[PDB]
């Protein structure tokens, strides 16, 4: 199988201007009614003999009933050329059954941090723009009570390219440029 | 004057038919008809009923025709004599 | 969007006013007996104020444009709903036609 | 963003050059008209020259005002062609009208179908049972 | 007296950006 | 300065482009690489007004490519040392000022800035203002800067802006 | 000299006031119904369903000119066109509104007939068809002959199949622009919903192939026509009986 690289550009919008950005994205993007998704994500890390712990991100859609949990592996950043102006990571996307939490724990993966993300999803061609407000989860297990991690909302432009050819980043840079006056989407390194 | 005008209009008709053939190949037929040979002002060969799923249809202009009327030529098969169909 | 309409109206009004003012002032300039002394100065002041106002309004409205002058031509259209409704109306018209034809045949039956 | 920055710069430059020019042309008309002492050139030249100059500057001012009107109209068209939030709201509003129309038509057609079907049933129970017998 | 500024309402906070991305990647403010 | 000069450039045409429309293909290709690239000796090249002449094609033995020497006329922009040119400020920072002159971008160091000029961090838009506010420099403003010297790298030229000379800056 | 100046100024201003006290209103109304954009000084609009997921390589760009305004239709989209489907037993609105609706209808009829003629020529089907220039002829039943023809006016008919042709190509557009492709889990990539459900809720071969089926507008239309003919036949037979 070929591998799937995810090109990601990440930026933030303060809540007061959220309405302007939502209207703007709707205009540039394909004419589809907004998704309004809500989801819960728990990251599992494997503490094996090698120092680096394998990180697998498990996502459950609380809002959409009868939809399978999604398990994804995100690789180390492959960004090199300054011209690309994008973050490149290897990605494997696998739909999983509800009994995902138990399989991972028996295998030995350990639950680490859990977050709940609520926001709007819009798409233009392959490009997908997700605008969401991350909410911290307190209490050992539950989604009833959440506190806001920040007033602002992260905006991420993600493309799951087949890894064939390139210029995928160029298209992304052009789209990012339009939102740049409303919000500066840039490639921010995860480190610090 | 007649020879020059005739040569010009027949070459223009050849070009129009070639454009029509390429337009048909592009949109509807799609490799169900092919272009074997096209000489601007001499002949244009169209192949139908390909070997995959050969025959050619040549449309030529000869300087000036007086003794014999200039019509089309189906070169490879030389179709049999069907009084109603060969005339059309 | 009535805001933009009002803006344009004000713009046109102010422009016309300022050019009338300029006209009057130059007419009084050629005048052999410029009786409108203080009046003329007041007119000059008014014209200047008008120009300044126009400039400010224009700059603000340009920003209002460039706040969403995304350049992007905008995709989203109503073509879907419109086409659907047109189809529905044509279907209802066809139904009406058939009903009328059946009614006419029934009338014919009664006519004998 | 680059292309939006350039559009803003061009419109703003149009407006700035424009206020500066109308004010300066009025100033040139007043630097003039001032009947100053004449010498060498002679009124026979100075006079006609001044008249022509005033006429030309008046034309220039009128043209600048016409350009102002043109730019205003352009801004108006841009704010109706592609404002963006107003346009999205308007698209949503037309979707509403069309959808309601469709709903009404659908209900009408369904009811019509039902009534016509009942009539058809009555006729099917009749015609079939008719004695006749050719 | 062409005043000075008129619209300085910042749409995005870079500190906010940093914090959010940081959390998403490692997990600051979530454990 | 904007200078219209003729350039000598070479074209490597792949044989696949041979056949119909080979001559204008070279003309079309010429615009592809000349536009968007700069050189220190001639400065940034904006556009090719016309092609003066087309040279004969020389194959490279073994390679199979062709060498077309083309004489074309184009306008170029090159900063010169010790000259004053109008500029536009792009971004304002305490460390220095970044200004763009078309394709050319110039950086102004804090030292080159006048001593009485100071950065205005408190103001939401980064800008430089004086104590008396007699002269204010802000993003997207007209200023004149003296080029201390012309320095180039990776087909890009950016110089230093000097405001010490008289009749410089915004007016 | 100042008299001349003043005269010119007044004339101009009063001319501007005469041109001030409905091109603007007309353009505004033209925008809500038809999407528009700004390029150069020849402001254009969209006259294609490309927003509603149609992969037809044609530019639906109609111009707007000052003449209180006129709409310029792209060439070859003028006149009136209507597709005609027939069975033989052998073998109020605004001025520019009418023009733009008619040209959009012509564009959609060309889209329909391009789809039908390509599926007739290239897709292998039972009892093959003949596509001559603007006319498709099929023989669904041996005594039956169905004919689909694109009548382009350029200034026996069954309406039901024409109406269903329009709705079929409309659903074929809306399949691409569907909300079923949206992944509600933010992490989830993209694609249809039941194709996502195929993984955990394990599907057989038959459900997988039923979600991703290959057929065509022509195949479906022929099936519909055959069913209609069969119904008619049975009805007539029972009537005679």
């Amino acid at each position: 199988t070929i591998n799937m690289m995810e090109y990601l550009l990440q930026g933030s919008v303060l809540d007061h201007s959220l309405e302007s950005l939502i209207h703007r994205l709707r205009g540039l993007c394909d004419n589809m009614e907004p998704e309004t998704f809500l989801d819960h994500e728990m990251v599992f890390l494997l503490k094996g003999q090698q120092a680096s712990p394998f990180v697998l991100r498990a996502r459950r859609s609380m809002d959409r009933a009868g939809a399978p949990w999604h398990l994804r592996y995100l690789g180390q950043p492959e960004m090199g050329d300054k011209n690309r102006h994008a973050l490149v990571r290897n990605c494997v996307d696998i739909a999983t059954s509800e009994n995902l939490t138990d399989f991972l724990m028996e295998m030995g993966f350990r639950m680490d941090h859990e977050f709940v993300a609520k926001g709007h999803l819009f798409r233009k061609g392959i490009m997908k723009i997700m605008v969401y407000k991350i909410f911290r989860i307190l209490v050992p297990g539950n989604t009833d009570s959440t506190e806001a991690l920040s007033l602002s909302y992260l905006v991420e432009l993600s493309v799951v390219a087949p890894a064939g050819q390139d210029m995928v980043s160029d298209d992304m840079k052009n789209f990012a440029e339009q939102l740049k006056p409303l919000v500066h989407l840039e490639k921010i390194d995860p480190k610090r | 004057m007649y020879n020059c005008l005739h040569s010009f209009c027949l070459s223009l008709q050849l070009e129009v038919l070639h454009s029509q053939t390429l337009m048909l190949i592009r949109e509807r037929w799609g490799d169900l008809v092919q272009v074997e040979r096209y000489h601007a002002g001499k002949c244009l060969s169209l192949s139908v009923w390909n070997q995959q799923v050969v025959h050619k249809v040549t449309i030529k202009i000869d300087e000036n025709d007086v003794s014999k009327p200039l019509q089309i030529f189906h070169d490879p098969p030389l179709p049999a004599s069907d009084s109603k169909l060969v005339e059309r | 969007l009535a805001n933009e309409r009002l803006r344009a109206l004000e713009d046109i009004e102010r422009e016309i006013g300022a050019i009338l003012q300029n006209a009057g002032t130059v007419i009084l300039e050629l005048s052999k007996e410029k009786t409108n002394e203080r009046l003329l100065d007041r007119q000059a002041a008014a014209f200047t104020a008008s120009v300044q106002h126009v400039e400010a309004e224009l700059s603000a409205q340009i920003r209002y444009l460039t706040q969403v002058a995304t350049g992007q031509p905008h995709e989203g259209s109503s073509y879907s709903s419109r086409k659907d409704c047109q189809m529905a109306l044509k279907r209802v018209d066809y139904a009406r036609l058939k009903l009328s034809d059946v009614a006419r045949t029934c009338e014919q039956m009664l006519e004998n | 963003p680059q292309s939006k920055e350039t559009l803003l710069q061009s419109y703003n430059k149009r407006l700035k050059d424009d206020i500066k020019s109308i004010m300066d042309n009025f100033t040139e008309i007043i630097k003039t008209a001032k009947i100053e002492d004449e010498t060498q050139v002679s009124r026979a030249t100075q006079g006609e020259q001044d008249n022509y100059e005033m006429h030309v500057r008046a034309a220039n001012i009128v043209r600048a005002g016409e350009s102002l009107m043109k730019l205003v109209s352009d801004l108006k068209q841009f704010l109706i062609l592609n404002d963006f939030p107003s346009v999205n709201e308007a698209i949503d509003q037309r979707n509403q009208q069309l959808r309601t129309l469709q709903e009404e038509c659908d209900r009408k057609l369904i009811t019509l179908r039902d009534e016509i079907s009942i009539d058809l049933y009555e006729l099917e129970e009749e015609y079939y049972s008719s004695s006749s017998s050719l | 007296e062409s005043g000075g500024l008129r619209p300085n309402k910042q749409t995005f906070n870079p500190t906010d950006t940093n914090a959010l991305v940081a959390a998403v990647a490692f997990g600051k403010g979530l454990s | 300065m904007f200078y219209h000069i003729s350039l000598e450039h070479e074209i490597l045409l792949h044989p696949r482009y041979f056949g119909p429309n080979l001559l204008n293909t070279v003309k079309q290709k010429l615009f592809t690489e000349v536009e968007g690239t700069c050189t220190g000796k001639y400065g940034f090249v904006i556009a090719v007004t016309t092609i003066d002449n087309i040279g004969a094609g020389v194959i490279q033995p073994g390679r199979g490519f062709v060498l077309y020497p083309v004489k074309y006329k184009a306008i170029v922009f090159r900063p010169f040392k010790g000259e004053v040119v109008d500029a536009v400020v792009t971004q304002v920072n305490k460390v220095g000022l970044f200004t763009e002159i078309g394709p050319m971008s110039c950086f102004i160091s804090r030292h080159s800035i006048p001593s009485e000029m100071e950065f205005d961090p408190n103001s939401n838009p980064p800008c430089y203002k004086t104590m008396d506010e007699d002269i204010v420099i802000q993003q997207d403003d007209e200023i004149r800067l003296k080029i201390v010297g012309t320095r180039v790298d990776k087909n890009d030229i950016f110089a230093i802006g000097s405001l010490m000379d008289d009749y410089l800056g915004l007016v | 000299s100042l008299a001349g100046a003043a005269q010119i100024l007044l004339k101009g201003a009063e001319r501007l006031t005469k041109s001030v006290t409905d091109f603007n209103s007309e353009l505004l109304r033209l925008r809500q119904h038809w999407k528009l954009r700004k390029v150069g000084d020849k402001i254009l609009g969209d006259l294609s369903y490309r927003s509603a997921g149609s992969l037809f390589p044609h530019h639906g760009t109609f111009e707007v000119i000052k003449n209180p305004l006129d709409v310029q239709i792209p060439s070859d989209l003028e006149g009136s066109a209507y597709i005609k489907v027939s069975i033989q037993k052998q073998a109020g609105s605004p001025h520019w509104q009418t023009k733009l609706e008619a040209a959009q209808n012509v564009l959609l009829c060309k889209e329909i007939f391009a789809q039908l003629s390509r599926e007739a020529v290239q897709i292998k089907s039972q009892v093959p068809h003949i596509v001559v220039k603007n006319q498709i002829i099929s023989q669904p039943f041996p005594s039956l002959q169905l004919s689909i023809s694109l009548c382009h006016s350029s200034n026996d008919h069954l309406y039901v199949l024409e109406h269903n042709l329009h709705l079929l190509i409309r659903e074929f557009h809306k399949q691409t622009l569907s909300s079923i492709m949206m992944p509600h889990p933010a992490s989830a990539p993209f694609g249809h919903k039941r194709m996502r459900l195929s993984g955990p809720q394990a599907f057989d071969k038959n459900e997988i192939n039923s979600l991703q089926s290959s057929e065509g507008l022509l195949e479906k239309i022929i099936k519909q026509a055959k069913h209609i003919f069969l119904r008619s036949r049975a009805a007539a037979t029972i009537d005679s009986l």
Side-chain angles (χ1 to χ4, degrees), chain D residues 26-117:
Chain D
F26 201 53
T27 311
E28 226 283 335
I29 297 185
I30 345 197
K31 256 7 173 65
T32 336
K34 268 186 34 257
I35 302 85
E36 236 106 6
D37 192 357
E38 52 60 64
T39 202
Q40 245 306 43
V41 48
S42 319
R43 7 66 214 161
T45 98
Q46 227 168 35
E48 123 73 347
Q49 236 213 273
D50 293 12
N51 153 292
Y52 175 75
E53 259 70 276
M54 237 116 301
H55 263 9
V56 145
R57 291 193 297 274
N60 215 17
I61 291 195
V62 142
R63 170 232 276 186
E66 292 177 350
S67 63
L68 293 174
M69 293 300 293
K70 183 178 179 180
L71 294 174
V72 174
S73 63
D74 233 351
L75 240 202
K76 178 183 290 243
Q77 268 174 30
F78 191 97
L79 212 350
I80 168 247
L81 280 225
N82 54 314
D83 180 34
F84 259 67
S86 164
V87 185
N88 283 4
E89 181 60 36
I91 261 56
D92 190 24
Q93 185 267 343
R94 278 210 56 91
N95 289 354
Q96 272 265 238
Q97 210 151 309
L98 281 219
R99 274 203 232 114
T100 66
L101 187 356
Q102 215 167 249
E103 242 55 314
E104 157 163 279
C105 260
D106 259 25
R107 238 184 359 87
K108 264 359 115 166
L109 252 206
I110 292 216
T111 32
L112 151 41
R113 155 156 107 43
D114 273 334
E115 308 313 354
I116 267 200
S117 94

Side-chain angles (χ1 to χ4, degrees), chain G residues 84-92 94-129:
Chain G
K84 183 196 177 190
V85 180
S86 159
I87 287 184
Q88 290 101 178
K89 245 358 232 52
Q90 34 111 352
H95 160 55
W96 31 264
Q97 182 65 256
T98 299
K99 278 200 193 174
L100 293 178
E101 278 170 308
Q104 195 176 19
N105 178 41
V106 165
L107 194 57
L108 183 137
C109 296
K110 293 197 172 211
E111 216 282 336
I112 287 175
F113 198 81
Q115 194 69 231
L116 290 173
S117 84
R118 171 154 62 248
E119 289 164 11
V121 168
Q122 279 169 349
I123 291 299
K124 171 207 186 313
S125 157
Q126 182 182 3
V127 54
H129 329 285

Side-chain angles (χ1 to χ4, degrees), chain A residues 117-129:
Chain A
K118 174 183 181 178
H120 322 270
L121 193 131
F122 312 92
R123 80 146 183 178
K124 179 68 171 301
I126 327 181
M127 275 95 64
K128 161 176 38 169
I129 6 269

Side-chain angles (χ1 to χ4, degrees), chain F residues 65-137:
Chain F
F65 277 101
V66 187
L67 280 290
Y68 301 125
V70 192
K71 304 191 178 187
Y72 58 109
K73 270 274 204 197
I75 297 90
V76 298
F77 172 33
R78 188 217 292 191
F80 294 84
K81 66 96 173 176
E83 65 88 18
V84 182
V85 56
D86 50 6
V88 189
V89 180
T90 74
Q91 294 82 18
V92 170
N93 277 349
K94 171 71 86 169
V95 182
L97 281 294
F98 314 100
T99 185
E100 192 71 39
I101 301 189
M104 201 294 304
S105 89
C106 181
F107 161 80
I108 303 98
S109 179
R110 185 77 207 280
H111 305 80
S112 65
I113 299 172
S115 44
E116 77 290 355
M117 190 64 71
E118 61 86 20
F119 182 67
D120 193 17
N122 60 74
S123 48
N124 193 353
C127 79
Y128 279 79
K129 58 183 205 85
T130 60
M131 295 297 102
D132 61 356
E133 211 71 5
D134 58 355
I135 191 73
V136 186
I137 296 90

